[PDB]
Amino acid sequence: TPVTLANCEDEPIHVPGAIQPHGALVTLRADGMVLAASENIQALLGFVASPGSYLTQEQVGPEVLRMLEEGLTGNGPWSNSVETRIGEHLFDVIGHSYKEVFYLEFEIRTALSITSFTLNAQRIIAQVQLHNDTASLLSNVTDELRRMTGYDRVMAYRFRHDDSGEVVAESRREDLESYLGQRYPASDIPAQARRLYIQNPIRLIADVAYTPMRVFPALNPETNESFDLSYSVLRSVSPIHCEYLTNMGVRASMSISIVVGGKLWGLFSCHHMSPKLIPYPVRMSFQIFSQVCSAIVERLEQGRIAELLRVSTERRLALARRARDADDLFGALAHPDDGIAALIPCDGALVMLGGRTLSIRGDFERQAGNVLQRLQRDPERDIYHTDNWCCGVLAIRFHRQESGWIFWFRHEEVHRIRWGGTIGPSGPRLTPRGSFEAWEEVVRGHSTPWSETDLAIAEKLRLDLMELCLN
Amino acid sequence: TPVTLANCEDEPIHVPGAIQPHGALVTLRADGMVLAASENIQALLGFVASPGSYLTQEQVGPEVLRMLEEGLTGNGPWSNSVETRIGEHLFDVIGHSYKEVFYLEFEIRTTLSITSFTLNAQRIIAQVQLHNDTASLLSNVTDELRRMTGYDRVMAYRFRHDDSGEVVAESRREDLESYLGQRYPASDIPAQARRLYIQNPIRLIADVAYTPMRVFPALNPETNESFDLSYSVLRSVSPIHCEYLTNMGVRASMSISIVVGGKLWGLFSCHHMSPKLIPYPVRMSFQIFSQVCSAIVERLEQGRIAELLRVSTERRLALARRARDADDLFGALAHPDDGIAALIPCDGALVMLGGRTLSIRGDFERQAGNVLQRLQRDPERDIYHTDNWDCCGVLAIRFHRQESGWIFWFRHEEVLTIGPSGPRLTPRGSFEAWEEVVRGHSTPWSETDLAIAEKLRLDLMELCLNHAL
Numbered sequence A: 001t002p003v004t005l006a007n008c009e010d011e012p013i014h015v016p017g018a019i020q021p022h023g024a025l026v027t028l029r030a031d032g033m034v035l036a037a038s039e040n041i042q043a044l045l046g047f048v049a050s051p052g053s054y055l056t057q058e059q060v061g062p063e064v065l066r067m068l069e070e071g072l073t074g075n076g077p078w079s080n081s082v083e084t085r086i087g088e089h090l091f092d093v094i095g096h097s098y099k100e101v102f103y104l105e106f107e108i109r110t111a112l113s114i115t116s117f118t119l120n121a122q123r124i125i126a127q128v129q130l131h132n133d134t135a136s137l138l139s140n141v142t143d144e145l146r147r148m149t150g151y152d153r154v155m156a157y158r159f160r161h162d163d164s165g166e167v168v169a170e171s172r173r174e175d176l177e178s179y180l181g182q183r184y185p186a187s188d189i190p191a192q193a194r195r196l197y198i199q200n201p202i203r204l205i206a207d208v209a210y211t212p213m214r215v216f217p218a219l220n221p222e223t224n225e226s227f228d229l230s231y232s233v234l235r236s237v238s239p240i241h242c243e244y245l246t247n248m249g250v251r252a253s254m255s256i257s258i259v260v261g262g263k264l265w266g267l268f269s270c271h272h273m274s275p276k277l278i279p280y281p282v283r284m285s286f287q288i289f290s291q292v293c294s295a296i297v298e299r300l301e302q303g304r305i306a307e308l309l310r311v312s313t314e315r316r317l318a319l320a321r322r323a324r325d326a327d328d329l330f331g332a333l334a335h336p337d338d339g340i341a342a343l344i345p346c347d348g349a350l351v352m353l354g355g356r357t358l359s360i361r362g363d364f365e366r367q368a369g370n371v372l373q374r375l376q377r378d379p380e381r382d383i384y385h386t387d388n389w390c391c392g393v394l395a396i397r398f399h400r401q402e403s404g405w406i407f408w409f410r411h412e413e414v415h416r417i418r419w420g421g422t423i424g425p426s427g428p429r430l431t432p433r434g435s436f437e438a439w440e441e442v443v444r445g446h447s448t449p450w451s452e453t454d455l456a457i458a459e460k461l462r463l464d465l466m467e468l469c470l471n
Numbered sequence B: 001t002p003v004t005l006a007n008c009e010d011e012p013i014h015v016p017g018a019i020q021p022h023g024a025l026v027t028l029r030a031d032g033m034v035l036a037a038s039e040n041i042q043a044l045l046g047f048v049a050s051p052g053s054y055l056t057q058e059q060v061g062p063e064v065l066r067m068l069e070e071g072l073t074g075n076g077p078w079s080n081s082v083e084t085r086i087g088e089h090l091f092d093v094i095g096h097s098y099k100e101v102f103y104l105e106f107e108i109r110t111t112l113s114i115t116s117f118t119l120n121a122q123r124i125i126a127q128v129q130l131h132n133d134t135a136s137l138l139s140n141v142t143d144e145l146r147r148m149t150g151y152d153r154v155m156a157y158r159f160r161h162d163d164s165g166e167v168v169a170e171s172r173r174e175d176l177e178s179y180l181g182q183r184y185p186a187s188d189i190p191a192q193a194r195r196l197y198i199q200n201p202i203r204l205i206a207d208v209a210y211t212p213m214r215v216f217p218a219l220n221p222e223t224n225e226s227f228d229l230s231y232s233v234l235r236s237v238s239p240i241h242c243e244y245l246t247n248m249g250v251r252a253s254m255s256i257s258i259v260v261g262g263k264l265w266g267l268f269s270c271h272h273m274s275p276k277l278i279p280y281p282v283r284m285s286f287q288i289f290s291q292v293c294s295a296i297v298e299r300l301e302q303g304r305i306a307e308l309l310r311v312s313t314e315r316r317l318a319l320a321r322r323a324r325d326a327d328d329l330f331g332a333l334a335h336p337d338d339g340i341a342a343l344i345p346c347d348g349a350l351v352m353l354g355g356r357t358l359s360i361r362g363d364f365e366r367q368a369g370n371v372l373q374r375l376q377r378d379p380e381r382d383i384y385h386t387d388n389w390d391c392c393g394v395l396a397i398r399f400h401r402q403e404s405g406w407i408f409w410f411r412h413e414e415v416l417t418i419g420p421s422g423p424r425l426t427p428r429g430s431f432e433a434w435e436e437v438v439r440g441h442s443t444p445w446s447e448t449d450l451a452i453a454e455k456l457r458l459d460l461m462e463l464c465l466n467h468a469l
């Protein structure tokens, strides 16, 4: 089936039957039988992988057969690399096992120093341990990545709870424009491409305008279903994503991944306006920056909600003094710097006890009237929140007999930073300007999400006004 | 002048002027002229350059003269490595520059070069990504080290405030004895050992019964003072620590350092009961772990107190509410899980106001009485604390001066083959040498405890002046 916009969602990009020509593939079964190969296995590998033939030291060499043989009898999913001369030019020979099949991949040797990488990994461990902000390691390491590799541009994305993603970091040649503060949707990265970005630390496209070197046979006879190139390194790129880059005028791609638990938290994307390829051992070197950042960013966000937790249980002890000192809360809760309006990031708030109604920062008495009416279907629902409806509402109930409530509200997510001052067939939706527009229709009517912590607190305050109201 | 127990605290082990046999050293200067060499240069490298000699292309080879030439052309601390054949075998050419002198060291190569170093790492730096408990991170990368390296035993040290170290993780083999919960004086690791352990992530001892392969000349002509070998990997070992390891039945060492800022926070100590050696590409696969791990111990500690604080200002909200919804300053402080009892880690606590007092966990009024009698010297003190004194650790604050409002938190005291120099060079001989260093003392008062006792005094200041109504 042809792959257009209505199909781009489900389009299998793991089983393309194709690869990139910068290397060759040979797929083997449980015993070592050649099930198929890229039609270019004789471009530089002087021999012919004939469907149904076998491995021979006269085609592949000692070290290769040696390695492969280790894998067919390998305990855990087999994966490894080997540098040995195959034919007349030198090769990087990397393989791996997936499902019940086996794969081999051959890269030519582009004629690094390790100490010179273990050295400026301290330029990054040091540089971010004075500064302690995830935004500044992303910002910092993003600069360092550019220097290490030479990529025309390199960006760092963060992925929100909606898998939307933003450009929170950038280093580019001043010859090019900027994409900082860019918000593209969850669509631009489909469930089956993102799943791949997690299974693979690094993904590398050597050339975008490349011609797909299909591997044949198309289907693997044992199963009669398309082979699964998920962990493949030369796997072909989606034809839709290709048109994207060549519109952006970008001709190469490499992506270090940041994985927290099981989420794609963010990744460093590196474009290059001309065909750029990096040797394999160098990409296993960056696969190391991958885990590092996923491990500092791990406890930065878990050492920064602990800060939010600190300053929100301080300004929640303050209202334990102010409120018992004078004795009717409508005072302490309206306090400017401490007190509810600031306690939980919002664009407004409301306090409701008895008949009195204190609307901090705006007239929210009318909305609160509706939110309590739709709380008559839910009696005994001492909490409520929503990102649509002034469409942000978070409400807790600290007193039942007398209407005892607290409201915080929000507006649509406002684009933090904006800017001001070559088309493809499949439409204009395939460009930066289009990605942004298609995000704007997703959040239309959607207020910033109530964060995991913005709700921990809401449930804490309600627990203080509980023992504070009663007595 | 020999080195005994008496000197060993000042032993200049950074300038030994000798190396471990398994490799060779060649000291150069700015312009690339040889200044010295180990006495085993010919045993290992086919050729023998002279004192004063220039680069002998015969000896080092093209790719290495390419490395040295970009090290002479450029300032600041230089660092790099190569692989090449020199003589019958081939080596790791591991060169650096410290101060103004150069050092080129050579180690055997017994092969995946750019894929072994990068393979070993993802194996252990993902051991740091897995837990949230800073005792788990230590218990685990200890076990994972044992497995990666086959070392007979590998330990994890946590260094305390006084610099005395504690063994907090261990995986030995069933034959060996346990060293878990062993405590040893800050002197076991002399001033310049604790320095080199910080300025150098990894330290490798090939053989403890080894015979030092002295480098000559012994005095650098340029300066007329011994060679400074701080950032060296084949530097000789102190005779005292050798005699210590052969007392323990140990001949092979390799330790990963943990530096949290400028302190030696702790380290992983790998032992082996028979000679052992780790390839250079695998030692750098650890030296990079050393840094990330210091980075993650960094956050796992600054996030562990940022949690203590959070639980402090929460149970400060417990008594603030309990004493303000009543007039019971005492009752509120008294509670089992809230208040002074469990606000700060203590073996006892005591609150005074007027002629009344209550002491949780014992009879502390007798001692507070004397802590006061001693504070009639400079009445102005609002905070006071030390670890010496009966119940030996006292943290005291004052919240109401007119009626002697005081708060106290108390702490008790901290819980056949032989050498040419004595028994004291043994695990048992060190556990006692620590039972003397910390006697009279008690668990120090952390930067955190103090920051809390302070927030609790202000907290009580405000609740007393608040009975103005």
Ligand SMILES: */C=C/C1=C(C)C(=O)N/C1=C\C1=NC(=C\c2[nH]c(/C=C3/NC(=O)C(C=C)=C3C)c(C)c2CCC(=O)O)/C(CCC(=O)O)=C1C
Binding pocket: A008, A009, A013, A179, A182, A183, A184, A187, A188, A189, A190, A193, A203, A205, A236, A237, A238, A240, A241, A244, A253, A255, A269, A270, A430, A431, A432, A435, A436
């Ligand atoms: C509906 C399917 C897709 C559309 C539409 C599309 O544009 N790409 C689609 C599938 C894939 N996207 C893949 C990676 C990917 N896509 C984006 C989208 C962007 N949004 C932006 O605003 C910008 C730039 C300003 C981009 C590039 C990004 C950022 C990425 C990640 C890699 C990169 O940054 O270049 C993707 C993976 C392909 C592969 O490597 O196999 C597919 C498929």
Ligand SMILES: */C=C/C1=C(C)C(=O)N/C1=C\C1=NC(=C\c2[nH]c(/C=C3/NC(=O)C(C=C)=C3C)c(C)c2CCC(=O)O)/C(CCC(=O)O)=C1C
Binding pocket: B005, B007, B008, B009, B013, B179, B182, B183, B184, B187, B188, B189, B190, B193, B203, B236, B237, B238, B240, B241, B244, B253, B255, B269, B270, B425, B426, B427, B430, B431
């Ligand atoms: C005053 C000189 C020394 C005394 C006394 C001493 O005990 N060691 C002295 C010199 C050095 N020690 C060095 C490292 C070091 N020493 C210990 C001592 C231990 N105490 C214990 O209880 C145990 C085990 C149960 C030991 C091993 C330790 C732990 C270490 C750190 C390295 C390791 O764990 O192997 C030292 C550095 C030598 C070097 O490598 O240059 C010197 C010098």
